From a paper:
Based on our previous structural analysis, we had proposed that E52 participates in a catalytic dyad with H109 to activate it for a nucleophilic attack onto C1′ position of the target the deoxyribose sugar cation. Further, in the structure of H109S mutant, a water molecule was appropriately located near S109 for activation by E52 (26). To further validate the role of E52, we combined the H109S mutation (where a water molecule is allowed to locate in place of His ring) with the E52N mutation and assessed its effect on the uracil excision activity. Expectedly, the uracil excision activity of the double mutant (H109S/E52N) was lowered compared to the H109S mutant. The Kcat of the double mutant (H109S/E52N) decreased by ∼10-fold as compared to the H109S. The Km of the double mutant increased by ∼7-fold, resulting in an overall reduction of ∼75-fold in Kcat/Km. Consistent with these observations, the distance of 4.71 Å between OG of S109 and OE2 of E52 in the H109S mutant increased to 5.71 Å between OG of S109 and ND2 of N52 in the H109S/E52N mutant. The E52Q, E52N and E52A mutants reveal that E52 forms a catalytic dyad with H109 to enhance its nucleophilicity.
UdgX excises uracil from uracil-containing DNA to concurrently form a covalent bond with the resulting AP-DNA. Structurally, UdgX is highly similar to family-4 UDGs (F4-UDGs). However, UdgX is unique in possessing a flexible R-loop (105KRRIH109). Our earlier studies allowed us to propose a reaction mechanism of UdgX, which involves the formation of a covalent bond between H109 of UdgX with the C1′ position of the target deoxyribose sugar concurrently with the uracil excision from this site in DNA.
Author numbering: 1 to 102, 107 to 208
Write the structure that this text describes.
Amino acid sequence: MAGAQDFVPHTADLAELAAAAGECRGCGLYRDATQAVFGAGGRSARIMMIGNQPGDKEDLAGLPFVGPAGRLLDRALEAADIDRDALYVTNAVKHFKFTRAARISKTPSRTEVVACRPWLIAEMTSVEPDVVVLLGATAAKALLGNDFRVTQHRGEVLHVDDVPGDPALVATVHPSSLLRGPKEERESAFAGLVDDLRVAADVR
Ligand code: SF4
């Protein structure tokens, strides 16, 4: 009776989960958004990556990480030599939350994050990843609690006992943060993202 939970079907099939998410009304965000954006990859993936929400391009492409942030992330994954076939990539909330200016993303509230978390739990349960990479604060707090700071713990192998399957957890920055800033800072941050991805990839 809470959030998206009744919209989630009793199957681990990612195709069926994604179809069902197309119908979710688990919070208000389905109203203005074009469609739900489910994650992508297969259930044998070892590494799950969780961003914050679909962006402008993702909302219309119907897949996660197709915009500039995805291209930067792809460059980081390549530099970490993580095979893109080992990846299931998704977001903490599945409907683009936005405003327009004369589309701009707006932060999902904790309520929206918790409302949508059943989809994320269904994905984690379906994929059974060895490691979950949390890309930025919103994703991290979904799983690690609303007080958690990515800045104080990024690149640490974490395990919290209330997360299904007890996967290793590695929090890092969201790739969108590495698009706007000074070059030396963007280059320094890029190297830290590669580092955090390598930590996650070396689990097991
Ligand atoms: S953001 Fe998540 S909970 Fe809210 S309507 Fe979309 S799929 Fe359902």
